[PDB]
Amino acid sequence: IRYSVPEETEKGYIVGNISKDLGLEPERGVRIISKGKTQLFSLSPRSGSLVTAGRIDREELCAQSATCLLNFKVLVEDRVKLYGVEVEVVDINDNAPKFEAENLFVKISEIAAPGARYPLPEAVDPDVGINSLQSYQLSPNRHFSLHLQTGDDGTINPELVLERTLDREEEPTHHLVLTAYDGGNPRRSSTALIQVTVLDTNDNAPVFDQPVYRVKVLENVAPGTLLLTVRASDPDEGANGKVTYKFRKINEKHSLLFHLHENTGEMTVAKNLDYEECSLYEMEIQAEDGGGLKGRTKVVVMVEDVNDNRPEVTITSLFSPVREDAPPGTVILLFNAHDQDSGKNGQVVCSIQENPSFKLENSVDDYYRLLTAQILDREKASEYNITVTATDRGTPSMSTEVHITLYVADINDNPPAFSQTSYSVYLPENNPRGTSIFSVSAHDPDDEENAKVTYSLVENTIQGAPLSSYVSINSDTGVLYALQSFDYEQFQNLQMQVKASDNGHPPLSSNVSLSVFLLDQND
Ligand SMILES: *[C@@H]1O[C@H](CO)[C@@H](O[C@@H]2O[C@H](CO)[C@@H](O[C@@H]3O[C@H](CO)[C@@H](O)[C@H](O)[C@@H]3O)[C@H](O)[C@H]2NC(C)=O)[C@H](O)[C@H]1NC(C)=O
Ligand SMILES: *[C@@H]1O[C@H](CO)[C@@H](O)[C@H](O)[C@H]1NC(C)=O
Ligand SMILES: *[C@H]1O[C@H](CO)[C@@H](O)[C@H](O)[C@@H]1O
Ligand SMILES: *[C@H]1O[C@H](CO)[C@@H](O)[C@H](O)[C@@H]1O
Ligand SMILES: *[C@H]1O[C@H](CO)[C@@H](O)[C@H](O)[C@@H]1O
Ligand SMILES: [Ca+2]
Ligand SMILES: [Ca+2]
Ligand SMILES: [Ca+2]
Ligand SMILES: [Ca+2]
Ligand SMILES: [Ca+2]
Ligand SMILES: [Ca+2]
Ligand SMILES: [Ca+2]
Ligand SMILES: [Ca+2]
Ligand SMILES: [Ca+2]
Ligand SMILES: [Ca+2]
Ligand SMILES: [Ca+2]
Ligand SMILES: [Ca+2]
Ligand SMILES: [Ca+2]
Ligand SMILES: [Ca+2]
Ligand SMILES: [Ca+2]
């Protein structure tokens, strides 16, 4: 005979009455013939019906078998043969479906196109039939949907559908909930936390912060200094987010002038710069990632001038000797100045040290003309030390120095002068014919020919004009010559005038009286 029983029922539950099926009143000495490790059954003498004495969990008995049966024999001592019975447990919904873990994740790439279905974790329910697993439901998401594959086997395969393309740069991971439902009401359920991990595709190219990097630096800039810093943006991950910087202008000398750190992207100075050589350095640099993805930006170096140059004087006209008769205003120097620098560093101030003798005049533009201020006189000063100082107007100031030595020429304006205003010479009567009797000296302040004395004598006729016959002088000896002997009784004294003239045109002359006195002797 067969019967049934609900699972997990308390001890003493109703089972098909045994006595009414055997054919005897509720003495009999009847006992159960089966043998288990433990037994869950015991017949009740109160009603003659078997009542279970232990909790029945067919999940711990038949597991997933659709029909769970417990067939056992029973023994009646009144008779000589046994009676075989069989009781099939039914299934109730007490177990909830279970997943493999509390947290499971699915890897999805960034390049994954919409329409891709990814396997979802499949749950398990110990129950059988309606009480077993029935359906799934997925939390709504803008990027995903749910897809179920029910089968003839009764098992459903769940998988998610990609609705919108994913992007890790906006959000790396998603958080969704997958719920599992059975059919045995009161229905159990099981939620499951799923994380959508987005992989990385190299779809981000490096993009520099600014499209143009600008720096303004002086020319005196020391090599090894840090010009600037260049940064590029790559939101990717790993080598796809790494940056490497290098110039695109690879052949010109600018590559030798600057240094660009391949990693840090620092623009530094390698060689000294010069505003006069070149002040506009336009270059184009480029950054790359792990792949061939690259970005460009322009770096512009602007150099500015610095006072590191001295003024340069070029002389056009020089007149080292000047005539002493020069009026105040005659030029003695003609030159100009020019600085290599620009602006206030290029303006020049040509200043002679203020002296009374000369003055400097800025005739036109920056051409300078050095002139005189008074009349010169080489008998008081024949030499002049001139120091023209050309200082630029920048800061700090740089001054070049031009030295001129000025020797004035000789113009004959000074006549020769004798040693005395008047000379007197004594000689006794006896006079050896043609002998020299005196010595007269003269001097001239001028130089060279304008100081060369040419001695002469006035031509006033003594009786018969023996001025030449009486006396003679040589142009250079400066000595007097008595030609004839003298008697105190013919003449006593003779007055002449000696002349001195400088031998150069125009000549300057000077006469001075000179008297010869004879002396008386024993005639
Ligand atoms: C303007 O300044 C210059 C120098 O800055 C003065 O020149 C003088 O020149 C002589 C040489 O010409 C200097 O030395 C001497 O040299 C001769 C040979 O030439 C030598 O024999 C001597 O033993 C001596 O070393 C001299 O030192 C130099 N300075 C002075 C003060 O005489 C020139 O005199 C200056 N002009 C005026 C108007 O002061
Ligand atoms: C001689 O000297 C006097 C005074 O120095 C001068 O006045 C006179 O003109 C001179 N004689 C001649 C011929 O120049
Ligand atoms: C899963 O869902 C069932 C039915 O919605 C609930 O009864 C259960 O408590 C869990 O929330
Ligand atoms: C769904 O809800 C259960 C509670 O029944 C959680 O344990 C689970 O992690 C998910 O959040
Ligand atoms: C000729 O010699 C006489 C001798 O007294 C000098 O006085 C004169 O100057 C000249 O040289
Ligand atoms: Ca159970
Ligand atoms: Ca069950
Ligand atoms: Ca269930
Ligand atoms: Ca992206
Ligand atoms: Ca990416
Ligand atoms: Ca990248
Ligand atoms: Ca320079
Ligand atoms: Ca300069
Ligand atoms: Ca300068
Ligand atoms: Ca003079
Ligand atoms: Ca000179
Ligand atoms: Ca003179
Ligand atoms: Ca003279
Ligand atoms: Ca005499
Ligand atoms: Ca005599």
Residue numbers in the entry: 3 to 28, 33 to 529
Give the authors' words:
The γA isoform constructs—γA1EC1–4, γA4EC1–4, γA8EC1–4, γA9EC1–5—displayed dimer dissociation constants (KDs) of between 8.6 and 45.3 μM. Unexpectedly the γA9EC1–5 crystal structure did not contain a trans dimer interaction in the crystal lattice. Given that γA9EC1–5 is a low micromolar dimer in solution, the monomeric arrangement in the crystal is likely an artifact of crystallization, perhaps due to the low pH (6.5) of the crystallization condition. We also found examples of small/large interacting residue pairs at the interface which showed correlated variations between isoforms such that heterophilic complexes would likely generate steric clashes: For example, EC1:EC4 residues 86 and 369 from γB isoforms, EC2:EC3 residues 125 and 253 of γB4 and γB5 (γB7 numbering), and EC1:EC4 residues 79 and 340 of γA8 and γA9.
By contrast, in vertebrates the clustered protocadherins (Pcdhs) provide analogous cell-surface diversity, but in this case generated through stochastic alternative promoter choice. Biophysical measurements with domain-deleted proteins showed that Pcdhs also interact in cis, through a membrane-proximal dimer interface involving extracellular cadherin domain 6 (EC6) and potentially EC5.
